[PDB]
Design an enzyme around this catalytic site. Sequence first.
Site, PDB file in Angstrom:
ATOM      1  N   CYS A 152       0.820  -1.208   0.000  1.00  0.00           N
ATOM      2  CA  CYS A 152       0.000   0.000   0.000  1.00  0.00           C
ATOM      3  C   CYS A 152       0.848   1.250   0.000  1.00  0.00           C
ATOM      4  O   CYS A 152       0.398   2.293  -0.476  1.00  0.00           O
ATOM      5  CB  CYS A 152      -0.981  -0.042   1.185  1.00  0.00           C
ATOM      6  SG  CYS A 152      -0.360  -0.490   2.875  1.00  0.00           S
ATOM      7  N   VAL A 156      -0.041   4.382  -2.515  1.00  0.00           N
ATOM      8  CA  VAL A 156      -0.325   5.753  -2.088  1.00  0.00           C
ATOM      9  C   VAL A 156       0.636   6.735  -2.742  1.00  0.00           C
ATOM     10  O   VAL A 156       0.244   7.832  -3.150  1.00  0.00           O
ATOM     11  CB  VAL A 156      -0.285   5.858  -0.549  1.00  0.00           C
ATOM     12  CG1 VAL A 156      -0.367   7.296  -0.116  1.00  0.00           C
ATOM     13  CG2 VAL A 156      -1.415   5.006   0.072  1.00  0.00           C
TER      14      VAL A 156
END
Lengths: 522, 522, 477, 477
Positions: A152, A156
């Site tokens: 993740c 991002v």
Amino acid sequence: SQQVDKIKASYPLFLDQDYKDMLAKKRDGFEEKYPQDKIDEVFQWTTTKEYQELNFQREALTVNPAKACQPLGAVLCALGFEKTMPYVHGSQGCVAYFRSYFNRHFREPVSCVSDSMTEDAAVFGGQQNMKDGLQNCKATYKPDMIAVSTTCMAEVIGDDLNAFINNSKKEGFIPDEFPVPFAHTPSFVGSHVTGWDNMFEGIARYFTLKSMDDKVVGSNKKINIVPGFETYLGNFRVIKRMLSEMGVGYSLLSDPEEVLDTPADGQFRMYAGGTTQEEMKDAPNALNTVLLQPWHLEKTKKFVEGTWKHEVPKLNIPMGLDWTDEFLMKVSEISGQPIPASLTKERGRLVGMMTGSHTWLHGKRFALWGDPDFVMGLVKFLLELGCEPVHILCHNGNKRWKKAVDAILAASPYGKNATVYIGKDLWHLRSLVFTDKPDFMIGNSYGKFIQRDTLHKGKEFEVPLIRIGFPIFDRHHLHRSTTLGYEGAMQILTTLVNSILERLDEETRGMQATDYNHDLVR
Amino acid sequence: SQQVDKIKASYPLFLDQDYKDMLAKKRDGFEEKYPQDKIDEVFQWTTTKEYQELNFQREALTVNPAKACQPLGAVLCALGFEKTMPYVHGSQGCVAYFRSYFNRHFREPVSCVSDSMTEDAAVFGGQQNMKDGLQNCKATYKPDMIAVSTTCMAEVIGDDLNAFINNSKKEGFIPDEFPVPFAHTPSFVGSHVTGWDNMFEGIARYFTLKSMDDKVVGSNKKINIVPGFETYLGNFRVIKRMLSEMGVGYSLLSDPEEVLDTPADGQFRMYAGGTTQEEMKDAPNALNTVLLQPWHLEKTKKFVEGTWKHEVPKLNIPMGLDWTDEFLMKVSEISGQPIPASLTKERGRLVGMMTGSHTWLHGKRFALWGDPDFVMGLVKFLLELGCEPVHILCHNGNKRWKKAVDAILAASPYGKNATVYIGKDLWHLRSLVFTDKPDFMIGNSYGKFIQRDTLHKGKEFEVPLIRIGFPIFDRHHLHRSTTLGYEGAMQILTTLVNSILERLDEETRGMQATDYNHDLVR
Amino acid sequence: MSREEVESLIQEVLEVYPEKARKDRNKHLAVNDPAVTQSKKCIISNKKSQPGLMTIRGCAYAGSKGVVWGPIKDMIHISHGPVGCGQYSRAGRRNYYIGTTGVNAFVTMNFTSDFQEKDIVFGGDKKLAKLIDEVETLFPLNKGISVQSECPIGLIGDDIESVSKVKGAELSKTIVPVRCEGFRGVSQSLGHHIANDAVRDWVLGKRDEDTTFASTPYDVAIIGDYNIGGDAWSSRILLEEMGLRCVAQWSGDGSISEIELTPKVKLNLVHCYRSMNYISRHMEEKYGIPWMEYNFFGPTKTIESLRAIAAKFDESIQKKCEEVIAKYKPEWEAVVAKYRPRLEGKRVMLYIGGLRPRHVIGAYEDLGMEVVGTGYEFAHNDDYDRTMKEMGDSTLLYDDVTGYEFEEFVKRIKPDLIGSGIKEKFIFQKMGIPFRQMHSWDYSGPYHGFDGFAIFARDMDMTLNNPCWKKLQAPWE
Amino acid sequence: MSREEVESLIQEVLEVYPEKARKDRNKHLAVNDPAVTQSKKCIISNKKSQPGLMTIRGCAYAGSKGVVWGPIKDMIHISHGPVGCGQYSRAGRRNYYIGTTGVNAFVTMNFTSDFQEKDIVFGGDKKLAKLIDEVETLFPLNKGISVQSECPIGLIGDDIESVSKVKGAELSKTIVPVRCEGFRGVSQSLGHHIANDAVRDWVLGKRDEDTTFASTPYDVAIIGDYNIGGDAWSSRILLEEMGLRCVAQWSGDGSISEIELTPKVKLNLVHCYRSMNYISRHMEEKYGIPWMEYNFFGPTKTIESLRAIAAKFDESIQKKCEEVIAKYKPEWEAVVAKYRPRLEGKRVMLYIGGLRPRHVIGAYEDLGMEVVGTGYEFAHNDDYDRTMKEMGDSTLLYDDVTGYEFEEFVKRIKPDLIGSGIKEKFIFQKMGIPFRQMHSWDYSGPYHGFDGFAIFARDMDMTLNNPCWKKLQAPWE
Ligand code: ICS
Ligand code: ICS
Ligand SMILES: [Cl-]
Ligand SMILES: [Cl-]
Ligand code: NA
């Protein structure tokens, strides 16, 4: 203290009186613990319908989820290809967890690399990590393919995987022809099964998208089989077995059964077996492609239908009697191969086992959870057995899937007491098994803590766990078993009926109280 | 009373207060029951060493035996031959029991006839029953072969089976060419496994004794396999599977796995599959004959070596790692066929499972019983796992067998606490598991009453039963399992380690008492 | 092997690498010299991992949530972010506790804010405030909340500190924001430090002006024992038999009150130097509490540690110390008598995290075994400073070893036993090498103290001498 | 099917037999006529089984040890002979009891003399005497012993009667010799009779000259209920709710004392006429005690029986009888309302032993089902006398049916449900015909009384309407 000839580990060592006394003084002296009456009072409250209503009003807190994150499934997908190293672009903590998680379920080596992005990548991006990571991985572990997914962090910050890989090849960190398929796998979208879908479609695109011109559907006379996220080795094997039994030519796309079951013969095989790159490149020439777990293969389906032009049939997961029947009938229609006598006999033996065990199964009430396709096949088979699925939980399921499972339930009298829950967790489920108690739970190892909680209320409230699903960490070698086909239906049926009879034996073992019903023959 | 939407069967119906009150009045009013204090005092006494010594001084009383009578084994043997009807000359009560015993273990139809000798036949003998019986059986159930055994009544009065069968043919009750092998199977000699041996030699004699002139050893290039008394369908199947894997030509003599697993497809098949009469006639032309359970195939051994002139190899039952290895190596040498890669890999997967589970299995203590070859193979495998067989009971074992097992025990450090018992019963074993308590029993369904007794002393004294053997009446479909070869070893290992973990989960399920050790990962 | 042979092994193994990785990994591999005190001139540590080489390391979230905070039993720890981290770390570590789980204790539960895309896009601070209210409603006996940040929290710019202050004030509750996002640092180690600073800043000072706790001259705290398999309990019992009062355990079986009472103790006993030295140094500077390192692995080190601890108090404690040693003497001598003959001379290679790769050597040596190689995932050079004197001359040392390197070293050195983690175990069992998990203790233990040594010895014997290791080769091969 | 078609079916089935068997079997198969009162004009019974036709019958030992004596819970029953009989009959019949097994009750244990060849050649009488001593030593709370002779005992000329007399006198213990060798008679039935005579000659008269039991006018005995799945308990509760005092139960959950007290009752309530009419007639002749048959299968018969029984006493018992009927009326009406719609019109064939083939007919009719065929293994003509008025006109009756006859009858009649035994069950499941065990109740029950009707109804519905029966044909065939 210890007796050298009867050494005690933590259980029962710490039940010794001197340890009990010490732990009492620790509690009373320094823990400022709530009084036991208050503890009992609050525990009782957490078993009530009042608490359940508050529990189901949660909007922001999740407790004891029943799902994992996308890159876990991308790794498992990647492990299924020949001499392929799974490679997760992003932070290395995730890979440590992915490997440990699969290690504990399979009790096997699990290889996976990271490119160990650090805080500087939060400002500057992770391109240098990809460049050096691909060269290092290729040189050190000598894969034939590196299949890239993401953590993740990388998602991002917005790392452009295609640009990073393309620059890596341009600058000679890896050869231009070395296969590096990739997929973006954000952990804040979907779950581990979404990551499997994303990784598979990325691999399928890599090998076919730009080479469709010479492809002809049906020209290789095979059927492609896409298994999805599958953690029972027997399920890969039973599909291959039944198709070979019919003489059906097939290609199983993503096949990790060899690499997750290598022999302990003195040598560690980092790679074994697996789908070949040629099989991916040749897949568009198949008669058709069958998706064993369609409810988490939607992106693969779009690509297979839209690019390969395969008329993917509308099949449920081949679990239970009806859906195994339908799978074999569809394979027969596509391949032109008849269903052989051996499979017709195996089907009859399963029906025979259903007739033999139906009296003990009838009306039995179950709470169950897992991934969407697994759960719906388990529900379908329970109905066929004349059991009552009562609490059906799919944390990572959606409204379309719920609608489909409600329809299956509506078509059987044994579904009258069932509710399907999506987005709910095992703390929700805990409330349901207190307020609307079933006979058993069917689920993964996390259910053991719900069984502990129910027993604490009293033995008559205990809901035993039947371990079917993923992950199973507290028993050995259940990953070798089977849930698909007739073979898997026989295994589930045997597990269910003997779980019923074990518990009945326990409840009737009491001499001169309940053992009037401790029958020798059942 | 009953609530119609929550109907209660015997358990827990009779726990209702009105039934409890009624049963208290029945006891107090009319049963003249011993006081509960005296009952408690005598129970405690039956758990002591003092009681054990008196128990082991028994010379005339048997309590809860672990064996059956010869004709039961004869019937099982006969069932394994194509279109063969088992026929027990003697009294019909025996046959109602033999059928029911197998019905309950296999959950399958079991066909078998009697000629229903009555008190008239006791005075005059049973020749008329044999004549009408053979004629009636052949016309009604149309078998291709009738295999005859005896009940103890016929053995005591001394019926001459050979003469009776010859006269049935001479007088025209059945065709002279119709095959009617026979064996004397007295229930007061040996046990059910002796009956199997006796029946098989009788069938082998019938088809080869008077036709040896034209036989040449090795001329058909096959290996004969004699399974013995075998009640796991998986064991028939694994042997055939491994031999086909190596491409070895073989002949399984007595093969009931088809007829004991017919599909439920709308029709009852009295007969299915089985060893053909041609296979028996040709058996002397095999390269050799292998006996899977030599310790109850002694009479068959004498005939095969004496008449067929086969050099029967000195092999143990192929249970566990070492003895499956030796089985495969001997088959390789006899057939000239090499052990293929697939069986080498399966072997390495077993070893992998042994390394994976060895910590939970190490040092665990077991009590176990069963037939001689099964028991010694289980003792051998347990030693290979690092477990401690402690109480080894074989009711129907002999001194030569005991000597052979004591030697196995002496060759391993894990055997230092083991004692082998022969001629002892399950009331003897009950004392042993009180005075020298093991962690588990491995045995058949009769062990459940020992577990009940131990629990009644207290939870810390409870010895749980692991169900491996014959008969298993209180669980469903375990007769489908495997205990031979690497497959059987893998299944036993998984059963043993997960029984250990199940029990640990039970002992550590108590909140704030023992659940500090209620680990998610094991 | 000679120093030259080991040096040659290192260089041979490194030839697989590209130049950049070769030059770096060379600095993390060394041949031991026990006279070294400045380990930085022999081996480098606590540096970033080389990309793509299959490090065994975890992240800062593991070191904060998994290691330091997770064990605190009467607090609720929120894994804040997407669903993975909290699930993979649910109940994987055997930090044992006494409590009623779900009611007054919460260690093996996974509380998570389960981030979806809408939370990444609009931020998670409103979800966190709502989640805290839901925790307070459904778990009213919790004594505090911690917020363990996963990777996205800092990357999307959320302000968990302001939420913790506002909500903590509103609900009169201790709410600890921890910035342990996994992109911070290079391993679990920075998470320790981040976790220690959060204890310092949000918890430890709360009783600074409270003088109602009744002190004694013999009050100590066990700092850095996470009670794996009960390790801290089998340590605590000996300290209290010696006459000391263990006021707190950081953080195995630990309660938040115990932590808040720690500044009242007279001496801090530090087992895991790596993970807790930060807070120990803080407590000396602020409260004037001295601290010392000790070692409860095996009888030789446990006896020395008991004597060194007792020496800090009066003669009455030193008398009870020699009484404790006399009591347990027949017990560990029976363990040595039974198991050392079965293990004498056997060689072991270790690879663990930040303490045990040097702390367990004495226990192996008490059974006649020799540690021929050792290393750490995430130790610093002050850890290696403490390791060289404990290891034999010309033994092999490896920092942040790669999967390739560890396998090649084992193939050459051929140890009789390897002790490492779950990602290593099943590799070496395929190779036919006995393996013991030295993090989880292979679901056994405790190993600390006298009672733990018996279990340790039993376990090493059961695995090293197991019959399964003689059977890997088929007899027809 | 019409009367003529059922006759044709019989004749067509008989064609397969050799002439001798055909002639005999013809006499044991009939088309029912409810008008006939002497059944011997339509069907013959209680004759020898034809050899080799696969009768479903057992032997006299089964009728004596397995049926009559084995349920008596506080005595020890010796299976005297070789090992098979006692083992195959160990705990196969669910004759339930309350006791401490192995201490004060022994029902599910297998006591045997395990004959070997030496015992056959030289006799077992010395062995039996020693065995009795060992029983007394190891099971001191037993209240009596029975010796259940297996086939060899009579053939070798043993004298178990002298052993029992001598050992019974020596040990002041009731020892009952039973000559139930399996070669005697033609079925279980003679075992019943032999067992009844053994009770008569060795137990029943022990209190003839003891006047200390205080009887009341409401003292009854339940005769011929073996408490299968608790049947006798759900029968006893109704009788005592009606105001009667059940002094004994023969022999389910039975004790030797309550057998000895049975000559003091005022009425013998006989459920199983076949197995216990002998001792009932004896107690009428010797003590003047009347006996009557009753039926507790289903609400219609249960109500009829309660009212017939109460009429033998007084107004107070009759008032309590109507209160019992009123109490349970909503309960069984709810059962009918739930399950009769699910079962109305369904057709069932039965084959059981000596009572239930007629006795359960009314319970099936209470759920709207029709019994289209029934028969017995070992009934006599007085049983068939009682069956023809209970069966519909032109239905099919079969005595001592062969395996071949039963399958052929089923193939033609096509019943919806079959109720029979374990040796029949799995044959008919393969054919796709719902099957319910009507001896063991398929490990369910009780079926007697109001509480048993609920279970009976649930059980017939669960099996007849189970989803499994719709799947036997593969969709591709
Ligand atoms: S360094 Fe140590 S085994 Fe103190 S080697 Fe190990 S990241 Fe454990 S209990 Mo893995 S002495 Fe750290 C540890 Fe504790 S790797 Fe971690 S969790 S607090
Ligand atoms: S009721 Fe009894 S065991 Fe009398 S419980 Fe049993 S259908 Fe038997 S010898 Mo099965 S006392 Fe009936 C009987 Fe006889 S089930 Fe049938 S055959 S004549
Ligand atoms: Cl939990
Ligand atoms: Cl018993
Ligand atoms: Na949200």
